[PDB]
Structure 1
Amino acid sequence: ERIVLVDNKCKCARITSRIIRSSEDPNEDIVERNIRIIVPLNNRENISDPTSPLRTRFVYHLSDLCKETCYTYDRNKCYTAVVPLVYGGETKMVETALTPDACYPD
């Protein structure tokens, strides 16, 4: 019945609308605007930095995603980071990961 308008995974905002069919009444149908927002709560500011301060201002511009730092992560997108480790005397720079089951090469 309803169709999906916006399914962006950056801000994790789901925008959709549905028309409700009433009884045999005049043309006074009610139009709705379904919005789904998931608060990250326990997440960092930068996308590739786990030492960022905890989020405090959750600003969501509804007029900007219907035409950029993303709070929520993506299951189908891999996130990598580099941290300087030693493990002895040589300072190597390996590539790390942020989310499980999302960075396995094909």
Structure 2
Amino acid sequence: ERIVLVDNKCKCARITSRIIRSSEDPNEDIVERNIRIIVPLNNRENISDPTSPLRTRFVYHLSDLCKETCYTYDRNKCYTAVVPLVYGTKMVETALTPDACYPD
């Protein structure tokens, strides 16, 4: 019944809303803006370079994302960082998350 104002899958924010149609009094209703965030406290600040510090601040200018440096691995679109391997050197690909980088 709620109305997802925003669902930002690379900040794990989700502003919904729902008018709490009150007890059947006159129009003394109050609309209601649920919010929800799942901050990781595990990832980098360069989400796609696991050679950086972790994170401390998590800033949500909701104005900005009520409409690109956002910090959760989105499930569906996957990432990578070309990484050297040595068997001689070779500068070669990776797949920084599995089960989504599957060329299928």
Q: TM-score, normalised by structure 2?
A: 0.90
Whole-angstrom distance in 2 between the partners of 1:76 and 1:67? 21
Structure 2: gaps spanning 5 or more residues: none
Whole-angstrom distance in 2 between the partners of 1:44 and 1:54? 4
Q: Deviations over 1:47-97 (max 9, x none)?
A: 22111111011111100011211111111101011112212xxx1111111
2:22 is matched with 22
2:95 is matched with 97
Q: TM-score, normalised by structure 1?
A: 0.89
Whole-angstrom distance in 2 between the partners of 1:3 and 1:33? 9
Structure 1: gaps spanning 5 or more residues: none
Match of 1:7, SS state, is strand
Whole-angstrom distance in 2 between the partners of 1:12 and 1:20? 25
RMSD over aligned CA atoms reads 1.2
Whole-angstrom distance in 1 between the partners of 2:86 and 2:45? 27
Poorly superposed stretches of 4+, deviation over 3 Å: none
Q: Percent identity?
A: 100
Whole-angstrom distance in 1 between the partners of 2:4 and 2:32? 13
Note the C-alpha offset of 1:5: 2.2
After alignment, is 51-60 or 17-26 more displaced?
17-26
Q: Deviations over 1:17-61 (max 9, x none)?
A: 011122232311011111110111011110221111110111111
